[PDB]
Ligand binder design. Structure first.
Ligand SMILES: CCCCCCCCCCCCCCCCCC(=O)OC[C@H](COP(=O)([O-])OCC[N+](C)(C)C)OC(=O)CCCCCCCCCCCCCCCCC
Ligand SMILES: CCCCCCCCCCCCCCCCCC(=O)OC[C@H](COP(=O)([O-])OCC[N+](C)(C)C)OC(=O)CCCCCCCCCCCCCCCCC
Ligand SMILES: CCCCCCCCCCCCCCCCCC(=O)OC[C@H](COP(=O)([O-])OCC[N+](C)(C)C)OC(=O)CCCCCCCCCCCCCCCCC
Ligand SMILES: CCCCCCCCCCCCCCCCCC(=O)OC[C@H](COP(=O)(O)OCCN)OC(=O)CCCCCCCCCCCCCCCCC
Ligand SMILES: CCCCCCCCCCCCCCCCCC(=O)OC[C@H](COP(=O)(O)OCCN)OC(=O)CCCCCCCCCCCCCCCCC
Ligand SMILES: CCCCCCCCCCCCCCCCCC(=O)OC[C@H](COP(=O)(O)OCCN)OC(=O)CCCCCCCCCCCCCCCCC
Ligand code: SF4
Ligand code: SF4
Ligand code: SF4
Lengths: 306, 160, 45, 157, 178, 93
């Protein structure tokens, strides 16, 4: 039964990823006064499948100077980290209940920036290596600001569990007490997923398809994590389907918000992005971290261990 | 059969042709993907003189345009005879490293020695100077090199 | 005969509002700061 | 015919459908014709709706749209970019310049057609041919690669 | 006259309310929210996409498309081998050879127009004194080989016979302007 | 056992995806990147210090814990201020 639960978790996530590619095409088209794909399939629902089949059907131009070991390792690592990122998520019940699931999430993102660094070093080009170093510095800085923000909001929550977060959120959203933190967390998740305006942008066919799959899977996961942490869905002990549906709706709105932002904004500069983080977020992140340290002490609202 | 049905047919017999898209130099480069080099009798008994594909094509075109080539058999061979082991040593040291892939007929033709072209006319008789593998080998084996080795003594030539 | 040719109407074309027109819409800075602080205190309580 | 050839034909249908439904170009764009290319990318004609993705890298490209005048200084760059593109690659020449030199046919620094450098699959005539006509050329390319029977040729080998 | 695009009149001072407004603007992303809103408005408009090939872009009778050689209503070729089209052809895409026909008429033996050399400028159809060569409205004639765009007299006459029901109507619609 | 099974399934799925992806078709150093890398090291170890705060919030001696956390985040701020003042945060020659 556990393997059946594994299948019914992972396969719909991949379906959501492919249709996220499709809905990004359609929303960007309709925001550009045009249409998305609709010829391929009834209403474009076969377009991501055609894209994936073409990407797996085209031969991969594999250069011999590139290390086959790293060329293999980077996309398979990125996809398996996206799926391992997805597993410990309660909706409102998880496939796997971890004691420190948020620490698991952040460290899995660290292994993802290993994946992008290894892909960049395997790509034997100096411009590719330079862009790889820029992307790793981007991902690393937004990872440190995610870790501090998430630490402070779980100082409000009580533990690194996520069912504890559900019990925290069952009366109100955490957006009201931690909304500047929510804004900075949203921007941080954007720059982790390398979406516009933080995209700042090598592989053909198979590896490119794998990287595309893992990136869009990470997009859906950052949306789901933002939903579960900051915008608590309605939870009732006698029915979990209401929680699943409401979390679904908020995750779809946050994914549409990423596509909205990519349509609306021009991309940042590399110096401007580092300047933005290290001069506006991290000072505010540290100040609000100490504020959220101080808050349960002077309000006596120290959360329970369970 | 070709000489029976078309008595004045120009028959051209080249040796093992090497080139950019050949199945000779790329084949010997693709032996490295296994653990070692599988040579029968360590390749000492086989003697080969490979011929460049551009040389063979120039000979073919000059045979189309040549009035004296009618009803003749030509031998298109390289200027230098190498042993199979020395050829493998040269290709591996030039690469610097250290549709079936191969068949029984393929390895039999590999281990068959090249005959001495004595009575037959050749590329010099059709007006083509046979360029050597040392001069026309870098453009073939460069695609199998590594990055450190992207940016070698010739194998010695026997008369027999 | 009478010449027929692509001409403007006798009354002339209407005015064309070529100037920049930003709507100038938006809530005030003091009151959005006030509602943000109020949301913060309500959430904290 | 044999039952295996029917399965091979259906597999060809599936592969050709995938390749023509997902046609990602890079436009090696030079000139007037590249401007008309981005007018085909424009919302009226919507090659993205057709399944044809605007601004793809040559590493991810399927077809090269040669749009403009190929000069002698640019032809090695064209050949290098064509060689960097992966093996299932097609070429749509567009405009009189890329077709046969066009209005600069007798020029000292203009290659008389990009077919002297790269193998052109489909020529789109005009100066510039309309975006309507370029989208015609793209759909003709989809029909052409629908007509391919690669596993049928391999089975009949 | 002239006007300033970035200069501002005098000073608006430094008031606490203005400082609070600027701080709210760059702390709560007001211009970002309004840009998101009007991009959402375009999400909620109607797309300007036509349904090719079932819908076609609008054109005019002046449109310069595929070349064609017309005829008189009797069926005689309108062309009289006068070579002004190749004289005025700025790309030198027209080659004409001519001789008297068996009845002594002045007709062409060769009329080749290179589509790959043509710039589709209409100089031939505006220099033709008898309305023989025309740029008819066909534009969907992309070929898979370079040879098929090297038109000759037979191909041009076939195009003229094919598109005569539309070329003559376009010339009827527009000939009073030219 | 469950997490082992899921991670093995994940790795197997990704490996079979790359296997079908292959089988189906048949220098000038810059100092500033190192600076932000080591700044990340220092801030990440300071996160490692800051991370046990969900259990440190439950202690009896809340005043001492609060003072230590305040001092630590203050020296985070002071180090970041140092690097900002000595221009380790900009990208300029
Ligand atoms: C789950 C998401 C991804 C889905 C991906 C698609 C899944 C379904 C795929 C169905 C078809 C599977 C096999 C298709 C392989 C066709 C390859 C092909 O035609 O290549 C032409 C070539 C033709 O070979 P050839 O003999 O002409 O030689 C090629 C080299 N030249 C032409 C230069 C001489 O290869 C084959 O036909 C080999 C097919 C092997 C199939 C193995 C299974
Ligand atoms: C979680 C749910 C979803 C939330 C987000 C919803 C979607 C919103 C999408 C908006 C568009 C985002 C696209 C990317 C934009 C990138 C640019 C950007 O945002 O730059 C950030 C900009 C950068 O500003 P900048 O670019 O002008 O630079 C500032 C520096 N100068 C001016 C010198 C150049 O703003 C910030 O960094 C501020 C972040 C928010 C801080 C909010 C603080 C509020 C008050 C704090 C609490 C105070 C009271 C404490 C308690 C008191 C109790 C009594
Ligand atoms: C999030 C918002 C998403 C988009 C909402 C609709 C956009 C259009 C609104 C109307 C408009 O254009 O107003 C123009 C105006 C902008 O007018 P302005 O640009 O002229 O400036 C206002 C005037 N001064 C200069 C004085 C400041 O927009 C606003 O006033 C809105 C400001 C932002 C309000 C929200 C701040 C926090 C956002 C993140 C926290 C999470 C919120 C909840 C998210 C829930 C879902 C995840
Ligand atoms: C291509 C090469 C790729 C190389 C890198 C692969 C990365 C894979 C994706 C990331 C996986 C991250 C796993 C991190 C470790 C687990 C984290 C964790 O929280 O573990 C503790 C947890 C139980 O702890 P707790 O929550 O306290 O529960 C007790 C209360 N009931 O759970 C446990 O105690 C379970 C202990 C095992 C958990 C990890 C299982 C790993 C499985 C092996 C992977 C490698 C297999 C060999 C190679 C295959 C081919 C490459
Ligand atoms: C994406 C997939 C496709 C779209 C999916 C969602 C479709 C939703 C359709 C229905 C939306 C209904 C909105 C309210 C309509 C009724 C109304 O009164 O509208 C007008 C009102 C603004 O009126 P006015 O008085 O000028 O405003 C003063 C201050 N509000 O307007 C409002 O107050 C607007 C309130 C809602 C604002 C957000 C609406 C869009 C939500 C989804 C965004 C997806 C982004 C991608
Ligand atoms: C213990 C101390 C720390 C407490 C926790 C907060 C952590 C903040 C860390 C960063 C602040 C210290 C370093 C300040 C600094 O170097 O500022 C430089 C800045 C001009 O440099 P520039 O890089 O151009 O700034 C624009 C940003 N892109 O200079 C300026 O912008 C000048 C700013 C002057 C005013 C500073 C704020 C005063 C607030 C008083 C509040 C009283 C109540
Ligand atoms: S064919 Fe005509 S429109 Fe196209 S690039 Fe050449 S001159 Fe410009
Ligand atoms: S339209 Fe073409 S054939 Fe006619 S004059 Fe112009 S370039 Fe020459
Ligand atoms: S201008 Fe007209 S009539 Fe004269 S040669 Fe040309 S097509 Fe014939």
């Amino acid at each position: 039964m556990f393997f059946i639960n594994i299948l019914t978790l992972l396969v719909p996530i991949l379906i959501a990823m492919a249709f996220l590619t499709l809905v990004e095409r359609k929303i960007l088209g309709y925001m550009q006064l045009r249409k998305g794909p609709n010829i391929v399939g009834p209403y474009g629902i076969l377009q991501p499948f055609a894209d994936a089949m073409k990407l797996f059907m085209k031969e991969p131009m594999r250069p011999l100077t590139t290390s086959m070991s790293l060329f293999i390792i980077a996309p398979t690592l990125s996809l398996t980290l996206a799926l391992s990122l997805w597993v410990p998520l309660p909706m409102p019940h998880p496939l796997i209940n971890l004691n420190l699931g948020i620490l698991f999430i952040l460290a899995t993102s660290s292994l993802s920036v290993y994946s992008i660094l290894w892909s960049g070093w395997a790509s034997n080009s100096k411009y590719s290596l330079f862009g790889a170093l820029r992307a790793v510095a981007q991902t690393i800085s937004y990872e440190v600001t995610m870790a501090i923000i998430l630490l402070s909001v779980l100082l409000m929550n009580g533990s690194y569990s996520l069912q504890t977060l559900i019990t925290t959120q069952e009366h109100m959203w955490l957006l009201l007490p931690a909304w500047p933190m929510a804004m900075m967390w949203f921007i941080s998740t954007l720059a982790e997923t390398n979406r516009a305006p933080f995209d700042l942008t090598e592989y053909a066919a198979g590896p490119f398809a794998l990287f595309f799959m893992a990136e869009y899977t990470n997009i859906i996961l950052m949306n789901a994590l933002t939903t579960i942490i900051f915008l608590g869905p309605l939870y009732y002990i006698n029915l979990p389907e209401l929680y699943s549906t409401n979390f679904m709706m908020e995750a779809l709105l946050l994914s549409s918000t990423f596509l909205w932002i990519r349509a609306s904004y021009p991309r940042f500069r590399y110096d401007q992005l580092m300047h933005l983080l290290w001069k506006n977020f991290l000072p505010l992140t540290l100040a609000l971290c100490m504020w959220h340290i101080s808050l349960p002490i002077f309000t006596a609202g120290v959360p329970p261990y369970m | 059969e070709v000489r029976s049905v078309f008595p004045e047919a120009i028959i051209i017999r080249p040796s093992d042709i090497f080139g950019r898209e050949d199945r000779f130099l790329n084949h010997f480069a693709n032996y490295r993907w296994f653990l070692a080099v599988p040579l029968v009798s360590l390749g000492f008994k086989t003697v080969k003189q490979p011929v460049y594909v551009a040389d063979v094509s120039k000979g073919i075109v000059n045979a189309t345009k040549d009035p004296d080539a009618v009803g003749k058999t030509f031998a298109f061979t390289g200027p230098n005879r190498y042993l199979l082991f020395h050829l493998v040593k040269y290709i591996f040291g030039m690469t610097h490293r250290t549709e079936p892939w191969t068949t029984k007929d393929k390895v039999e033709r590999i281990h068959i020695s090249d005959v001495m072209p004595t009575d037959l006319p050749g590329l010099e008789d059709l007006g083509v100077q046979p360029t050597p593998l040392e001069l026309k080998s870098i453009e073939v084996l460069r695609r199998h090199r590594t990055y450190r080795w992207l940016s070698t003594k010739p194998a010695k030539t026997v008369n027999y | 005969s009478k010449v027929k040719q692509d001409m403007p109407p006798p009354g002339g074309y209407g005015p064309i509002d070529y100037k920049r027109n930003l709507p100038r819409r938006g809530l005030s800075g003091y009151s959005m700061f006030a509602v943000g602080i109020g949301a913060l205190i309500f959430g904290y309580w | 015919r044999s039952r295996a050839e029917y399965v091979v034909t259906k597999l060809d249908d599936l592969i050709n459908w995938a390749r023509r439904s997902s046609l990602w170009p890079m436009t090696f764009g030079l000139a007037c014709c590249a401007v008309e290319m981005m007018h085909m990318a424009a919302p009226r004609y919507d090659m993205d709706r057709f399944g044809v993705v605007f601004r793809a890298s040559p590493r991810q490209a399927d077809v090269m749209i040669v749009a403009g005048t190929l000069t002698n200084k640019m032809a090695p760059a064209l050949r290098k970019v064509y060689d960097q593109m992966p093996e299932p690659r097609y070429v749509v020449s567009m405009g009189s310049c890329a077709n046969g030199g066009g209005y600069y046919h007798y020029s000292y620094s203009v290659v008389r057609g990009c077919d002297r450098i790269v193998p052109v699959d489909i020529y789109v005539p005009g100066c510039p041919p309309t975006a309507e006509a370029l989208l015609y050329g793209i759909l003709q390319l989809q029909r052409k690669i629908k007509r391919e029977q690669k596993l049928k040729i391999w089975y009949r080998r | 006259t002239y006007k300033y695009v970035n200069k501002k009149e005098q000073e608006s001072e430094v008031d606490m309310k203005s400082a609070t407004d600027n701080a709210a603007r760059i702390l709560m992303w007001t211009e970002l929210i309004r840009g998101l809103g009007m991009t959402l408005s375009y999400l909620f408009r109607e797309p300007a996409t036509i349904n090719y090939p079932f819908e076609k872009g609008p054109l005019s009778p002046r449109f310069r498309g595929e070349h064609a050689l017309r005829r008189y209503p009797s069926g005689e070729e309108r062309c009289i081998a006068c070579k002004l089209c190749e004289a005025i052809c700025p790309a030198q895409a027209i080659t004409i050879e001519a001789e008297p026909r068996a009845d002594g008429s002045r007709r062409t033996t060769r009329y080749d127009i290179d589509m790959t050399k043509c710039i589709y400028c209409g100089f031939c159809q505006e220099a033709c004194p008898v309305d023989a060569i025309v740029e008819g409205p066909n534009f969907e004639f992309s070929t898979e080989t370079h040879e098929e765009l090297l038109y000759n007299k037979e191909k041009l006459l076939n195009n003229g016979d094919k598109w005569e029901a539309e070329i003559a109507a376009n010339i009827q619609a527009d000939y009073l302007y030219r | 056992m469950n997490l082992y099974t899921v991670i093995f399934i994940n790795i197997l799925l990704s490996l079979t995806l790359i296997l079908v992806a292959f089988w189906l078709p048949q220098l000038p150093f810059s100092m500033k990147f190192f600076l932000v890398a080591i700044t990340f090291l220092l801030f990440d170890l300071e996160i490692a210090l800051l991370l046990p705060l969900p259990w440190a919030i439950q202690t009896i001696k809340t005043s001492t814990m609060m003072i230590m956390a305040f001092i630590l985040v203050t020296i985070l701020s002071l180090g970041l201020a140092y690097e900002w003042t000595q221009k380790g945060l900009e990208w300029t020659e």
